[PDB]
C-alpha cells in the first residue's frame, strides 16, 4: 500500500517567471479557496490508501491539489499565470472524472470552482 510521490514542486530545468498576477494567484485566488470550508480534501494530495481508492492514480494520470500549486508558487516554478491556472483546472476536473455526479467531492469542487473562476476574472 503506497501512493506514488506527489506531484514535482521545483524544477531547475523549466521556464520560470515572477509576475504579478501569479503574485495574485497566490495572495488573493489560492488564499480565498483555502480558507474555504470545502477546501480540506484538495488541500494535500488525495491519499488513495487511507480513502480505500485503489483504482485513483491509477485512473488519473496527471494528480493535483492545491498543497502542490501552493508550494510551487512559492517556489516561483510557473512560467506564468496560465500554467498555474492550468492546474487548479487540471484538480477540479481530476476530481468530475474519477468521481460520479452528485457526490459529495464533485458538489463541493464545483462550488470551490465558481469561486475559482469569480476571482481569477478580476486579473491584471
Not at 93 to 115: H, Q
Request: charged content about 20%; glycine content about 2%.
Amino acid at each position: 500500500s503506497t501512493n506514488p510521490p506527489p506531484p514535482e514542486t521545483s524544477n531547475p530545468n523549466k521556464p520560470k517567471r515572477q509576475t504579478n498576477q501569479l503574485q495574485y494567484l497566490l495572495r488573493v485566488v489560492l488564499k480565498t479557496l483555502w480558507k474555504h470550508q470545502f477546501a480540506w480534501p484538495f488541500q494535500q494530495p488525495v491519499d488513495a490508501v487511507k480513502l480505500n481508492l485503489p483504482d485513483y492514480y491509477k485512473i488519473i494520470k496527471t494528480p493535483m491539489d492545491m498543497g502542490t500549486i501552493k508550494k510551487r508558487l512559492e517556489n516561483n516554478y510557473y512560467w506564468n499565470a496560465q500554467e498555474c491556472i492550468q492546474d487548479f483546472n487540471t484538480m477540479f476536473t481530476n476530481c468530475y472524472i474519477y468521481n460520479k455526479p452528485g457526490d459529495d467531492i464533485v458538489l463541493m469542487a464545483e462550488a470551490l470552482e465558481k469561486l475559482f473562476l469569480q476571482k481569477i476574472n478580476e486579473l491584471p
